[PDB]
Design a protein around this nucleic acid. Sequence first.
DNA 1: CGCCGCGTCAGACTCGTAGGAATCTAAACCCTCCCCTTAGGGGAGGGTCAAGGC
DNA 2: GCCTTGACCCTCCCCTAAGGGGAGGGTTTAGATTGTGTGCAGTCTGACGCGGCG
Lengths: 49, 79, 49, 1336, 49
Amino acid sequence: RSPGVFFDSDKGKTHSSGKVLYNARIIPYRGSWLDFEFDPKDNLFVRID
Amino acid sequence: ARVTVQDAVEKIGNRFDLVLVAARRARQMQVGGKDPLVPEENDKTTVIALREIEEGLINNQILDVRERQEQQEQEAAEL
Amino acid sequence: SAAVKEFFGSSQLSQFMDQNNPLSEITHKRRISALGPGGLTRERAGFEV
Amino acid sequence: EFDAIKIALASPDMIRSWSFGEVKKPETINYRTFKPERDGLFCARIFGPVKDYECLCGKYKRLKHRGVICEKCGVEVTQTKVRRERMGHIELASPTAHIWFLKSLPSRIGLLLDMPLRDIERVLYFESYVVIEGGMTNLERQQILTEEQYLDALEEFGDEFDAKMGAEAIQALLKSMDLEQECEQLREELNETNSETKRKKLTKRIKLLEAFVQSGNKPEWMILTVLPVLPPDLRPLVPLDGGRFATSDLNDLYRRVINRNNRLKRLLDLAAPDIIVRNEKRMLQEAVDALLDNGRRGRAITGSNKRPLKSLADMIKGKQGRFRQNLLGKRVDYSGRSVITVGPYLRLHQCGLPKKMALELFKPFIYGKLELRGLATTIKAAKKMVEREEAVVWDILDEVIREHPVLLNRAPTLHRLGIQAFEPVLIEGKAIQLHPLVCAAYNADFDGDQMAVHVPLTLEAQLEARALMMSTNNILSPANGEPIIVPSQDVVLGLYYMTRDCVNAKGEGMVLTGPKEAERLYRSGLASLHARVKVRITEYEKDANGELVAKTSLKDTTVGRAILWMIVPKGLPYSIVNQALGKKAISKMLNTCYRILGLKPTVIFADQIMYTGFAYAARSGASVGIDDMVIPEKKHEIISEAEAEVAEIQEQFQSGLVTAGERYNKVIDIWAAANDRVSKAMMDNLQTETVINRDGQEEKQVSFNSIYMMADSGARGSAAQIRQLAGMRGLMAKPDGSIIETPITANFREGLNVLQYFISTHGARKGLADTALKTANSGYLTRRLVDVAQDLVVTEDDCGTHEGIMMTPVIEGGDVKEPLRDRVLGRVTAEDVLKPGTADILVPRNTLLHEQWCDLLEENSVDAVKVRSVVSCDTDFGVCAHCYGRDLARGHIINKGEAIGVIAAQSIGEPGTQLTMRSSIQVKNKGSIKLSNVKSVVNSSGKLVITSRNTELKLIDEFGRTKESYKVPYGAVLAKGDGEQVAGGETVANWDPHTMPVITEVSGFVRFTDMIDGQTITRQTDELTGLSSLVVLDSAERTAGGKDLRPALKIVDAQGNDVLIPGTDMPAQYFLPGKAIVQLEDGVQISSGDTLARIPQGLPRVADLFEARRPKEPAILAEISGIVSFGKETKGKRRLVITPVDGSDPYEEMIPKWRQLNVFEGERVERGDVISDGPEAPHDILRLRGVHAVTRYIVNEVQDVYRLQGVKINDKHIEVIVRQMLRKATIVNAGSSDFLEGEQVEYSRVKIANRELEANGKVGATYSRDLLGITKASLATESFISAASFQETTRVLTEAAVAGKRDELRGLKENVIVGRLIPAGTGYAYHQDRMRRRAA
Amino acid sequence: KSDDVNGRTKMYKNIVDGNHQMEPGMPESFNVLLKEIRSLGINIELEDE
DNA sequence: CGCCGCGTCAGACTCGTAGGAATCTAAACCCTCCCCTTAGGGGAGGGTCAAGGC
DNA sequence: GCCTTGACCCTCCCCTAAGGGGAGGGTTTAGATTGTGTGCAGTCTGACGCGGCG
Ligand SMILES: [Mg+2]
Ligand SMILES: [Zn+2]
Ligand SMILES: [Zn+2]
């Protein structure tokens, strides 16, 4: 996988309601990963490594 | 020789009991001094035992009465 | 010396050269692998990769 | 030797009694002279001498001095083998918790103390104090203190109380607790409780404390104070070839434990500051944890690779643990392996074995026969003869292999025909020669496959190879009674080419004296194999007796059919060959020979069929060329016409007549239609295009095209593949699964271009990745099935039960998927089968339904036969031979001692690699009609209105059997009077798919009740309807009032009188749910049947069905029968109250109303009918409908997956697994029994207990049978050895240790683990006389 | 054939003497298993009655 | 007390040959104990060779 | 032929005088120094136990 920021989702594979939950992932060449994501209640969550 | 064992399974009505009777008789012939009750046509003792079972000459009851006869005979034949 | 020795002799991507015929050799040299250090694992690689 | 295995907790004294000394140093061996160091982990004084019969110092060096312990070195002079048996111990300087009884969930220390694992872990890590005893103090027992709370209460309340940290604190708590007093306190607390969560909490803790009381275990033994040390030869430190040493990770872990323990002892001697001692105690704890289970608590300790060290728990668990790698399967001696080739000359019972392989595999046999025949004076002379390979050792080898079978095995051994026994024929190659007819059993092709050879050594093994495993015993499948040693490829092509007929073939129309004349004419070149001819054929038939009576007649046959008749055994009819013989006809011919004549004619017949088919496929010269792929001459214009259609649809999309969705679907449809047109044109130009002259006149006959002959004979190839060769390849799918809208208009005879080839690889790789990734899933499912069913064996001959399942043909919609004959063949009846002419016994009660009884059932009109099943067998710990029925591999009733569970699991799991890992009624045929579960009224327009949701339509023939079965939604209006003839295509039922109508109770006039207008209604006018409608909307749409209060549409007479029901005085009103559209006003009359309101609406599947997984949102079923009412709404959980008439009334559920309900407040329900809709959960089916309903559901839902792929499995095998899933029962009322309530016991145990309790007049327990998946059912067995060897070895060994379990070795796995005869098969007699010479 | 250490040499000698009979004992890996479960704190034992 | 999202745990193919992993790191004192050095000496323990004596 | 008898003979182990050589073990060492240090991960899916809200 190339380094950079990648925007993805899970397509209804969570929360049993078919709601698509999006996420962003900053992947460096060397360093820590930085993930943002949406919960089923549309709050933005950061997650490091 | 022996291709299909089906004719011996009809006499000894089980395939699982057939193996036990035939192995008992085959061990009698192999390491005991027992001679086959059928003409040994270059067969091994397993196949000879199967050929005796398929002719009605050997089953569990015949083997039992034979060993009881030999046991009472040799326990009685000493002073 | 140990770092480069470990890479060149012990990496998953440092592979015993396939030397059956000329085609084996140039197929081995033109090979891409998703596996390796920093890549995928063949056990958890899904259907879509 | 022994009869059980017991497991328990080890006390410190038990651990010190195993040991032969204390390990005091981490020294392994001296670095200079590699003798073991004293008091170390390798120590000859503790663990035994390193040389056999020799001390370490060398002072006592021979067996003359045995058993004497040297006074210089301390080593006992004995065998060095004792270093595999002698354990040691480490006396731990601090008590250390065992990590299994702490951290394997649920925690035994936590459950026994009733402390959270969070508090126990805080005390263990010296972060918190715990009060062992409160004393004259306000502190309660087990109260956790932080350090400041401790220093407060210590100076404040003196040393009256006692509080500690560490595992010494946990040990003092486990020692200070009284188990019997706490059992009584918890039991009287259960008799004070109604909350079922707390009741489950309490029954868990109570049975833990009771297991501790009944066992000899003490709680405080879950804290280690002595540590056993494994014998050093099981953790060896051995010199490698280059002088380097190889060691186990256990030596690293043991050395760390010793080092931290010795440093702890040192620190306690120095009286170190307590921050240093607490750190050393934490380090000793984590070292002991890493030794026992590395990676449970914290990060795994890695040594010198950054690879985690293999702990003691990793030695025994997993695919590479002791159980699965060394005990459940092994590497064996007298075993070889080679590439297999074909021998087409072989007989069915023999293989070809290389002489070089046989000379090694049979080597002690050759040594024995060389010494016996005097050709060698010594076994070493014989060894040198076999090394030199003298000419006489080949004669010795030819006589040692003579009647000696060998087992041939191809991996994967998916079923038992993956091991078969053969008599070896010594060949000169290096490749094993396999008989062709057995390859389908092995799933073997000759493109590089290898097979393993195993030599049976003992006379019993030789006779089992000959009598059970020989390939001439294996001609029928055990999964289904079909032949598995069956012709294929070349044989069926040769037999098909031989039995076909040409129109004007050479020698047509002569009259032959018999089949020998036909062979003479064919071989001398005077007649063609296909010349239709007249042959005098004499065929024999079996009369009422076993006699074989002949009839001779002139048959109209071909020359090749007469030639083929010469190898057919005598009891078979000539019609068996007077046709072109494809794969199906040859398989049925072999099955017919088997059922009529038996096994000995059938194996000879199969060999003759193979030889003849090979010979005449050779004679045919049947090649494949490029001119055989005949492309239809009109394919180009079919493609041009579909291109014109797709162009006009594209122009319609440009002109806005269609949106992209219907545009794409139209393109897909006109390309699928054009593909079907090309396929039909190709097959029509391929299948008959032999035009041939009969006396000058042209005539069409079936084609002798080679591609067509291979496809039509069933030799190789389908019509779907001829389509890709000569038609077009058609539409391809994206990796998404969505169809690419431009198909491959090419075939493989033409080329594909680059783009067509790329989009074909899209799906080629998807299929190959499925094949590569689904073998693991199918192997895992088969392993779970074997391990749930391994202990099931036919143990009894008849249990005398009268229960059974009612077998009917499988009819889904208007197709008969499974007839009665193959659902009921080989099964024992459970009741007397009667004719439609009543009370006359057609088939008596205990009949095994062989083929003649099935033909008798077929010539009568029998549509349902009640048969005996294994789920309804009354036999404890096994199955009777009558509830099982036939052994499908033999054809007779199953024998006692057959491991039917392994057969069932292999029969289900073998086809798993053929599965994939990733409105109105139109009656088809004529017949009477009958409907079931109908709520029916008469409409105003001469109708039948079925206002029910459980009704189903069934179409009966003049025979009397149901041929089609549909079922119709609520309020489906019938276009038919029910009970008389219909026609084909005749519509019987019409309804609305997208909306749900409300159908009235009786005729009358509209009246309103509780529908306060403006608050329950939006009166909206549809501009082109003329009369406005009234909507009852959502609850958040309107204010307080009618939002939850229900509009009730009453029906009364015009004089105001409420109309009363016929038979009951129930008030006739209709309560309607929200989201309803009503078109009615008050005053207009409505008869019964007017619709007032409209409320608008592979392999993983089999694995989910056997694991009994509840689906994502299931159907909702009615627990008790009664009338529907509603309680607290407006929470999100709609509260349904089913009200019985004669029972305890209130029963509520919490149905979340975001799923549409399918019940009304006025209509009753039966227990278990669908209230809401969705995939049914099998636990609900079992609870509400029963055991027979859940087995019917599971066999139908599994055979739907298997029949869809054309896989034929008997449902004996699914019923075996279902029976093994219904093995537990939860006690609902104990009575005068030894069980609690809500306790899950074995069903056989509670059944035997009730047998004894109702034998002594007392009342037995009442239970509810549980359904467990194949993993939870195989982990809940009464045998801890089989459960620990299956999976979750830590949980199983932990619960078995704290419960003090005992394993009596009654199943197959436990006798395999321990190296015994299995209790099945030829070891069944041995176990029977082992148990009757123990019970006597 | 695999693990019974005393029984496999007896079996070899029995084959060489023309006596195709086995005297099977306990597999050695079951004894390894018993010693490895006892090296945990667990008293696993054969009930020799 | 009951239910919902979150933390956690446990499972997931057998043949030939290659085939591991590769970093990092006191010195000056003292002691006892064991073996070593000639050119053989001495003894214990165990065998061997011709004599005969019956 | 069975049995002693006196003389020989073998290897093996320990000893020599004045330390040499080395292995393997202890002990202190006084400018001042005061919180480690790595990754790695594209598994999914059940299933169980629990804080936390209602
Ligand atoms: Mg192959
Ligand atoms: Zn010694
Ligand atoms: Zn039964």
